[PDB]
Amino acid sequence: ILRIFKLSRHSKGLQILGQTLKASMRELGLLIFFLFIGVILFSSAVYFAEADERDSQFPSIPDAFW
Amino acid sequence: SSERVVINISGLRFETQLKTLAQFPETLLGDPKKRMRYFDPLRNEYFFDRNRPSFDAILYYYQSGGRLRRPVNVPLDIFSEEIRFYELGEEAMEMFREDEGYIKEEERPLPENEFQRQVWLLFEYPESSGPARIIAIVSVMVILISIVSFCLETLPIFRDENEDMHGGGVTFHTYSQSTIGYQQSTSFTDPFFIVETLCIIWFSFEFLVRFFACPSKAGFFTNIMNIIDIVAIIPYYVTIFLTESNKSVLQFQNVRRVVQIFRIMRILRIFKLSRHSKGLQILGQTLKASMRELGLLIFFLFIGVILFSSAVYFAEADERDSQFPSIPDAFWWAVVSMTTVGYGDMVPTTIGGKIVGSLCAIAGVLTIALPVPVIWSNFNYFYHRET
Amino acid sequence: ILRIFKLSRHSKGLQILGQTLKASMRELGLLIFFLFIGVILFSSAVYFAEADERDSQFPSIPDAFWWAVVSMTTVGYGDMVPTTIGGKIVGSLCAIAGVLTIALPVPVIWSNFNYFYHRET
Ligand SMILES: [K+]
Ligand SMILES: [K+]
Ligand SMILES: [K+]
């Protein structure tokens, strides 16, 4: 499916978005990290919060990552 | 005196009264001896072969009696040089910076004692030694491991294999283990207890080493980083204390809620990474700044949940299948709708309930939207204030 | 429940949001109107798009008004949803549109609000 990116040779826009990411990597990075901290943290509390219910939809903490 | 003084800045002519300059006599212009060097007796003026735009601010500083505002058109580095040049003094300079948004970092306390300095440097500056850096990695590795381990403790493949995994009974060992997350034994049979103890040994180690190698023991619990360091170990020791003080099934059962609470507190160890993350720190400062807006967002949201969850309730109250039991129940719906998450586990069925619904959405879209600008700012500040 | 607004006498913020709305009414107005145009239009296409299916979740066009809003505000409960390739193409658009419609007043409010706010605190 990466063949989709072959269009970038004929798209300025694709290219512009291309350069736009490369520049932003650091912020684009933090967004991921912050999000990570927040998933582990939140998915973790919700798990225990529902752990004593007989119908917890959260099986394990890594499950609630979703 | 009102005798008039002409100061020629690279051709741009300025005039003032001598008493305006005399006002501050420590300065170049205010001191006859210092400005003498620049006097042109042929033209009766002091000449400076210097940047032009900066001057008014410099002169206005005398005329205003102290106001030193940098012109909008003048770069901060050129202006500050000009200030340095004209010898306006350290006070004016500081005020200027402060008003310019630069906060003095003051100075960092120093150990003096050769040993503490020797140690403190590789426990707070990875910079200080290649070894100091090595420690840092280990600290990050241990933190990451403590997280992965804490999480795996909840995986059914592991928790679900126990002496009463098929509903058979409760065993005090099984019951405590389940609550705690691991088996606390001297035997050290349970791998989870092993990893946790190892991790907490290190964490305990860092905290101790920092508390005895730090220059000041007074500004120690003021620092949020140290607080984090402590919080990261408090659960472990408190669990031990609690279990050994209630070594009976009924006793434990009577303190289980607290044990559970500490178990959840263990996840705060995540924040230990903030000592090694600039970003975490930048987000850290970013929140503290925004609290007021971050506050209102909460309050506005509160008003909106109570209000909206309230109308939707009554709107669906006469239906035999209202998904909204009570008004406080629909608090859940309101939030989920306003944050546009919209699970769908609750939902109005009535034309009345749906009109509320629509609004409730459109509102949350706009409420939520407000703090955004604020944060981008404080954050975009503290960020470009490092990187 | 309006008694909640009694707190506005003791809240600057409530007051600031208060003034912020009054100012924005015109934009706050258009947002509503644009949204209206978009619901009628979108809820209308999705209806017909699913009309020939024996399990259309959209009974009438005014019924799908609900779907439209929920989709445009991206809440997306899921209590109603197109099943057809036609209904889904409308669906997609209907979303992307609401994302952009909704987005417009935002700048306005930040302003009026950011004004009245720093005009006190
Ligand atoms: K959404
Ligand atoms: K959603
Ligand atoms: K949804």
From Swiss-Prot, chain B:
Phosphorylated on tyrosine residues; phosphorylation increases in response to ischemia. Phosphorylated on tyrosine residues by activated PTK2B/PYK2. Phosphorylation on tyrosine residues suppresses ion channel activity. Phosphorylated on tyrosine residues in response to CHRM1 activation; this abolishes interaction with CTTN. This is probably due to endocytosis of the phosphorylated channel subunits. Phosphorylated on serine residues in response to increased cAMP levels; phosphorylation is apparently not catalyzed by PKA. N-glycosylated, with complex, sialylated N-glycans. The gene is Kcna2. Mutagenesis with N-ethyl-N-nitrosourea (ENU) lead to the discovery of the Pingu (Pgu) phenotype. At P21, heterozygous mice are clearly smaller than wild-type and have abnormal gait with a higher stance and splayed hind limbs. Homozygous mice are even smaller, and about half of them die between P15 and P35. Mutant mice have difficulty staing on a rotating rod and perform poorly in a beam-walking test, where they display flattened posture, severe tremors, myoclonic jerks and ataxic movement. These symptoms are alleviated by a drug used to treat cerebellar ataxia. Coiled coil: none annotated. Disruption phenotype: Pups are born at the expected Mendelian rate and appear normal during the first 14 days after birth. Starting at 14 to 17 days after birth, mice exhibit susceptibility to generalized seizures, followed by full tonic extension, which in mice often results in fatal apne. The average lifespan is 17 days; none survive more than 28 days. At P17 seizures are very rare and abnormal electroencephalograph activity is only present during the seizure. Belongs to the potassium channel family. A (Shaker) (TC 1.A.1.2) subfamily. Kv1.2/KCNA2 sub-subfamily. It comes from the Eukaryota. This is Potassium voltage-gated channel subfamily A member 2. Voltage-gated potassium channel that mediates transmembrane potassium transport in excitable membranes, primarily in the brain and the central nervous system, but also in the cardiovascular system. Prevents aberrant action potential firing and regulates neuronal output. Forms tetrameric potassium-selective channels through which potassium ions pass in accordance with their electrochemical gradient. The channel alternates between opened and closed conformations in response to the voltage difference across the membrane. The cytoplasmic N-terminus is important for tetramerization. Interactions between the different subunits modulate the gating characteristics. Besides, the cytoplasmic N-terminal domain mediates interaction with RHOA and thus is required for RHOA-mediated endocytosis. The transmembrane segment S4 functions as a voltage-sensor and is characterized by a series of positively charged amino acids at every third position. Channel opening and closing is effected by a conformation change that affects the position and orientation of the voltage-sensor paddle formed by S3 and S4 within the membrane. A transmembrane electric field that is positive inside would push the positively charged S4 segment outwards, thereby opening the pore, while a field that is negative inside would pull the S4 segment inwards and close the pore. Signal peptide: none annotated. The chain holds residues 43 to 56 of 499 of the full protein. Detected in brain. Detected in cerebellum. Detected in mitral cells in the olfactory bulb. Detected in cochlea. Detected in cerebellum, particularly in the basket cell axon plexus and in the terminal regions around Purkinje cells (at protein level). Detected in juxtaparanodal regions in sciatic nerve. Detected in Schwann cells from sciatic nerve. Detected in dopamine neurons in substantia nigra. Detected in large myelinated fibers in juxtaparanodes in the CA3 and CA1 areas of the hippocampus. Homotetramer and heterotetramer with other channel-forming alpha subunits, such as KCNA1, KCNA4, KCNA5, KCNA6 and KCNA7. Channel activity is regulated by interaction with beta subunits, including KCNAB1 and KCNAB2. Identified in a complex with KCNA1 and KCNAB2. Identified in a complex with KCNA5 and KCNAB1. Identified in a complex with KCNA4 and FYN. Interacts with PTK2B. Interacts (via C-terminus) with CTTN. Interacts with ADAM22. Interacts with CNTNAP2. Interacts (via C-terminus) with the PDZ domains of DLG1, DLG2 and DLG4. It is found in: Cell membrane; Membrane; Cell projection, Axon; Synapse.
